[PDB]
Amino acid sequence: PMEEEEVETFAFQAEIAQLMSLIINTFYSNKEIFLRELISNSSDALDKIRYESLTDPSKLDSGKELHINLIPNKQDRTLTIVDTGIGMTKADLINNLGTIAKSGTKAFMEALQAGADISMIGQFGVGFYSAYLVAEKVTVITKHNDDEQYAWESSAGGSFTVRTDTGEPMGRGTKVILHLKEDQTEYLEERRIKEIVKKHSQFIGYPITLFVEK
Ligand SMILES: Nc1ncnc2c1ncn2[C@@H]1O[C@H](COP(=O)(O)OP(=O)(O)CP(=O)(O)O)[C@@H](O)[C@H]1O
Numbered sequence: 494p495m496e497e498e499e500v501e502t503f504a505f506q507a508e509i510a511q512l513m514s515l516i517i518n519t520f521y522s523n524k525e526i527f528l529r530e531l532i533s534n535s536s537d538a539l540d541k542i543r544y545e546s547l548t549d550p551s552k553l554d555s556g557k558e559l560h561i562n563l564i565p566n567k568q569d570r571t572l573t574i575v576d577t578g579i580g581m582t583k584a585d586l587i588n589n590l591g592t593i594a595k596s597g598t599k600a601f602m603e604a605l606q607a608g609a610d611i612s613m614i615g616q617f618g619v620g621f622y623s624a625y626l627v628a629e630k631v632t633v634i635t636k637h638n639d640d641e642q643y644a645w646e647s648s649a650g651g652s653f654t655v656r657t658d659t660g661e662p663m664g665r666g667t668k669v670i671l672h673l674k675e676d677q678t679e680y681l682e683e684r685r686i687k688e689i690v691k692k693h694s695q696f697i698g699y700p701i702t703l704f705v706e707k
């Protein structure tokens with residue numbers, strides 16, 4: 494019996510779309526900082542659930558462990574960053590991951606044009622989009638307490654989609670699945686991941702574990 498799923502498509506805010514095009518169609522060295530940006534997001538989300546659970550300990554019913562997992566998959570060429578942080582509601586996804594303007598976007602594009610290192614992306618308030626330095630497509634699966642599990646996805650080009658996720662349930666948190674570009678497969682290698690975590694993500698505040706398939 495055929496299943497029916499609803500999909501909603503959203504336009505990125507105009508300057509966010511411009512930034513994504515810049516990131517994708519311009520050569521930048523030092524792309525490895527994408528992972529720092531994603532781990533920083535996870536750490537921030539872990540702080541949020543940690544503090545919320547001081548007010549309401551039942552907010553940890555959906556899982557007490559506060560941690561980050563990194564999962565390279567050489568078979569399907571994906572690198573996944575999973576956290577057990579606060580997650581995002583549907584409204585959070587739509588608002589926070591593309592539709593609302595960020596005040597630093599224009600300044601950042603000017604900085605890049607003038608030769609700034611791509612590592613400055615976080616300072617300008619748009620760190621997530623560093624994912625597109627290495628990924629041709631990004632899928633974000635997320636589960637916030639008191640809301641359903643959702644999947645956000647974009648291959649850039651000006652829009653993203655959101656749908657209720659009918660895949661494997663997560664208790665609470667977010668998974669960012671990077672479908673790596675063919676020339677960026679170094680980020681599936683355990684040595685390289687270890688190197689960049691050590692270099693850029695030394696003060697995370699939560700355990701991080703790298704899972705490596707035999
Ligand atoms: N792992 C995650 N868990 C929960 N929310 C996340 C998330 N990753 C991203 N987000 C949401 O997406 C927003 C945008 O993330 P982004 O990294 O671009 O900016 P930011 O708010 O972290 C400032 P910065 O530029 O310093 O990183 C976050 O503020 C948060 O609301």
Ligand SMILES: [Mg+2]
Pocket residue numbers: 530533534615620621
């Ligand atoms: Mg961030």
